[PDB]
Structure 1
């Protein structure tokens, strides 16, 4: 198991514009297009992302292309972030995947704010971090995905994904 598969499991694949758990316009593998309520605006962002007039629909390859960009962007974001980078460098390969997942989902900033859990992760207090991570809107809104992510940080294995 790796980051791509992991995220593919958490986000799914949709080739047609859809609304996310928050009600935001999305396409492919969790690619947020816009926070605006307008489908038009969404479609326009989509066309700009793909580089063609899509009319709200894309192919698998297109979706995968957005996905590769998005993962690349997430790692790079962590790496440039002053609060995140150290957390990331302190972790093993599996747990690094867990942190990338949260960032892909909630953005850097979002993640940069679990200040207390970050400290705990850096000190390698797994059980503690997992508890603290659970006290969050994140966990309350997407409890099943969140539990998968937290078990990965707790255990250091891919078990939640098997």
Structure 2
């Protein structure tokens, strides 16, 4: 298992514009297009992202290409973030995947807001961090995905995904 396969399980793949769990216009492998309510503002962003007139539909390749950029951006955002970097550096390879996952879903800013959990992860207090992470809108809104991520942090294995 690796970050790509992990995120592909959590986000799925859709080749036509869809709405995410929060109601936003998305496409491919969890690629957020816009927070705007307009399907037209969504199609525009999409065409801008792909470099062609897409009429709201893309190919598998196009999806995977967006996905590669997004994982890359996720990692680079963590490494450029003063709050995130130290956490990431302190973690083992599996747990690093767990943090990238959170970043991919919620953005650097949001994750960076989990101050207390971050401090617990850095200290390697797994059980305590898992408990703190669960007290969040995140866990309440997407409980199955949150539990999988949380279990990855607690355990340091890919069990939740196997």
Confirm or deny a common fold (TM above 0.5): yes
Partner Cα distance (1:75, 1:48) in 2: 23
Q: CA deviation at 1:26?
A: 0.1
* Cα deviation code 1:16-62 (max 9, x no counterpart): 00000000000000000000000000000000000000000000000
Listed as ranges, the gaps of 5+ residues in structure 2 are none
Once superposed, what is the RMSD of the aligned Cα atoms? 0.1
Deviation at 1:65, TM superposition (A): 0.1
Where do 1:114-129 residues align within 5 Å? Answer: 114-129=114-129
* SS state at 2:58 partner: coil
Runs of 4+ in 1 over 3 A off after TM superposition: none
Q: Offset at 1:147?
A: 0.1
2 CA distance for matches of 1:158 and 1:21? 24
Normalised to the residue count of structure 1, the TM-score between the two structures is 1.00
Shift of 1:88: 0.1
Aligned equivalents of 2:136 and 2:117: distance in 1? 11
CA shift, 1:7, in A, is 0.1
2:68 aligned counterpart, secondary structure = helix
User: How many angstroms does 1:15 deviate by?
Assistant: 0.1
- Secondary structure of 1:16's counterpart equals strand
